Amino acid sequence: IYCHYYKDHLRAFKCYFKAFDLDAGDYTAAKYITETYASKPNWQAASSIASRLIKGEKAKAELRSNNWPFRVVGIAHLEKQEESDSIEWFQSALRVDPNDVESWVGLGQAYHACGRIEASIKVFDKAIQLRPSHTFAQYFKAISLCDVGEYLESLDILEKVCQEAATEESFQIGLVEVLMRCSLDLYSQGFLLKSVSIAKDTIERIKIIISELKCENQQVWIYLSQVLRLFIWIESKVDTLPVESLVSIFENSQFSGSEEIDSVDNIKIDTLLDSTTDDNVSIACKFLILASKYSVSDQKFTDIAGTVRASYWYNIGISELTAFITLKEPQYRDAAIFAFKKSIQLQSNTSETWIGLGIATMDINFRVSQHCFIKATALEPKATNTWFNLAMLGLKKKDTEFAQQVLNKLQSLAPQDSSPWLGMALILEEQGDIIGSSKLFAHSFILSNGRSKAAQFMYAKNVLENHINNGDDERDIE
């Protein structure tokens, strides 16, 4: 009566709530209450009503036709970030109404949270198949596609969406994500020149985000940070780097600023471009730092246990360190150590920060650098980088045997990496057993498959040093 005739929401709700408690077998009440709470939104309640109804088994006949209880429990489980539990519910809901789009979407989203990624692809694909006017399904499908590694489709999707609803943030950020992932991937796989193009593209997109939406995620700045590295690493097209776009990207976004960090590196948006006679590379470095540094613990953000602060200072540390290694200027080293120090206190369990600290301490005093590397090896035992860096320090202090021992340990650990073999070679070229050294440089290069600069360089050098005056004839194919 209240629901249809008197138009009294509160009283009707109270009544139905009073009813369900006594009956538990009347579809109507459950539906009204659930619908009311679904809009609130308070899913922890709807999950209770719905679950109670389903478990009741007093409406087995009604639920053979309408699927909302299952869905509701599922969604409730989704928003608790217990996706694995969510599946059995969605899967069951769709068995009733296989045309229920949002349940497919939810299901695929749950799959994606269980690394059933290709399945996610398929689910979202069906979701779109039903409702092709669905933007979120396309988004999710795009991301999953990106995760599986098919960037083209992902990008066509995300661009096609981003055009259609440029008002929304998630889509744009997604475009950036997929783009930079494409960049790093294509860089890693050897497509060096195209990587830069994708980098320029994605930075332009980031500029567009900051200018069009003024939308500030923690992620965009990391994305930019990761993209910029490419200009730094591959100097050939470092001139492609758009200064203007960057200046705009930084000028538009508002950062409170950190004097303690800024004072170490001497980098501000107004200051860095003021310098004259500095190469594009250094400019890129400065932008890398500024970007990594500008990343925002935005308003209304809830940092769980404060890991994010550590990640922030850490990222800053890595960036500073990159600048230091690239430019060989102490400010970036001091800044790097400072940042890693700041990050360490906040966290103190992540192996990866101690590594950076160790790297940043190789020159000043080895004992601490070692100490860091050792702590790192202890904090992540499966980490192969640590041991190698430590070995390289081992070489730095001219301890052959040690470095060789560590490197042997690595060959034991991970023989697929080119690095350890290269190190082992270098030791032997310093040692003088040059034939075996050449064998090793060769093997290292071969395993590298063009991954590392030093491998290629050292290989070529060694090939020459061997075959320049040993009396080779032009006929010898090899």
């Binding site: 050897g190 497509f191 020149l193 195209k194 193009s197 032009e474 194919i477 090899e478």
Partner: protein
């Protein structure tokens, strides 16, 4: 599904070396040095000799060393099937193919599309550009001994209701970048509207099909002895921006992969081949790579070498998936096995003149999972067909 298994054979298909082979939905056409074009029905029924469903037709006295066929369904009503060929004379011949009313026998109609000024050119390679929204009109690319690429547009109808009258409009040319100009040994055109032109000096030039503008050109390495390196075949990847270049390093065949956005070298396909007796070398084939072909998916690259081996590589990992060894006695008909040639040389392991991937459904087979297929022509005057053991 990268395991191919042989389906039908025709031995002694010609009286002289078969140089090029091509196919479409309806048939597989093979040209040879006897100047005869040979249409082989793709649609065969169990245990039927391909030669029973082979239709042959003369073309030029000198012989033909390149053939390509274009089959489209032009208007919603009309079916278009057109074979183009280059003869050793250099002449570019065109033949419309159609089938008899009831007999379903093949009928050739030599079409005359070129003007007298054009006919004077000595063409070598050719390729048909299907109407894949590149522009709306079917295009034809060809190469001459002077190192120029000719680009025509092919209009089968008169000013757009529909009547049959074919015309080839010369869109224009793309001259080689080098000087002296080199011999344009092969050509290909991509789905995204790019022409690749391969010269005999290890140089390849990438240009736009639509705008006839050259975009760039790259070269192949190890140039110690000038006459060594030359490009045998170039083929675009359907899927990606990839381009596979097959070139010689004197006495050996090499496949190099370039990506076409910025046109850089991304890898090279090789396997342990023979060098210096006991030693092991890194080439694609112990002898020259004669021709390339990509599967529909673009994941597999099949290479036909002069060493009588068809090698199928995986493009993504750049490693080799599998290898097929050609033999004179693979042929199902004993009387058609060509053990030794005219001079009494042995053709036990006959080099592969050419290879081609056939799309799923072209080659009809009984009680086999409808799948992709393969075709190749080999020095023993033999034409072989395989199917890709797979599923659908």
């Amino acid at each position: 599904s990268k395991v191919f298994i042989a389906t039908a054979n025709a031995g002694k298909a010609h009286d002289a070396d078969i140089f090029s082979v091509s196919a479409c939905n309806s048939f597989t056409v093979s040209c040879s040095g006897d100047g005869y074009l040979k249409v082989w029905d793709n649609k065969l029924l169990d245990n039927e000799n391909p030669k029973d469903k082979s239709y042959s037709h003369f073309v030029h006295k000198s012989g033909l060393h390149h053939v390509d066929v274009l089959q489209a369904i032009e208007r919603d009503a009309f079916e278009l099937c057109l074979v183009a060929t280059t003869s050793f004379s250099g002449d570019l011949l065109f033949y419309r193919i159609t089938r008899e009313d009831e007999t379903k026998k093949v009928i050739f109609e030599k079409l005359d599309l070129l003007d007298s000024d054009m006919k004077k050119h000595s063409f070598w390679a050719l390729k048909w550009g299907a109407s894949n929204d590149r522009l709306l009109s079917h295009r034809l690319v060809a190469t001459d001994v002077k190192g120029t690429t000719y680009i025509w547009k092919f209009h089968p109808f008169a000013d757009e209701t529909l009547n049959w009258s074919p015309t080839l409009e010369l869109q224009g040319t793309v001259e080689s970048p080098m000087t002296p100009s080199q011999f344009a040994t092969s050509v290909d055109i991509s789905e995204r509207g790019l022409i690749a032109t391969g010269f005999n000096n290890g140089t390849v030039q990438i240009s736009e099909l639509s705008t006839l503008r050259p975009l760039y050109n790259f070269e192949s390495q190890h140039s110690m002895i000038n006459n060594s390196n030359s490009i045998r075949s170039v083929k675009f990847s359907p899927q990606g921006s990839l381009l596979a270049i097959a070139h010689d390093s004197n006495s050996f065949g090499c496949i190099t992969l370039y990506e076409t956005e910025f046109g850089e070298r991304i890898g090279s396909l090789s396997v342990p081949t023979h060098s210096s007796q006991a030693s092991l070398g890194e080439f694609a084939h112990s002898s020259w790579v004669m021709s390339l072909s990509f599967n529909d998916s673009g994941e597999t690259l099949c290479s036909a070498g002069w060493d009588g081996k068809l090698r199928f590589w995986d493009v993504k990992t750049k490693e080799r998936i599998t290898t097929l060894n050609m033999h004179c006695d693979d042929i199902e008909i004993e009387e058609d096995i060509l053990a030794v040639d005219e001079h009494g040389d042995s053709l036990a392991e006959p080099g592969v003149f050419d290879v081609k991937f056939l799309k799923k459904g072209w080659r009809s087979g009984m009680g086999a999972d409808l799948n992709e297929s393969l075709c190749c022509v080999c020095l023993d005057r033999s034409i072989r067909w395989f199917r890709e053991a797979g599923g659908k």
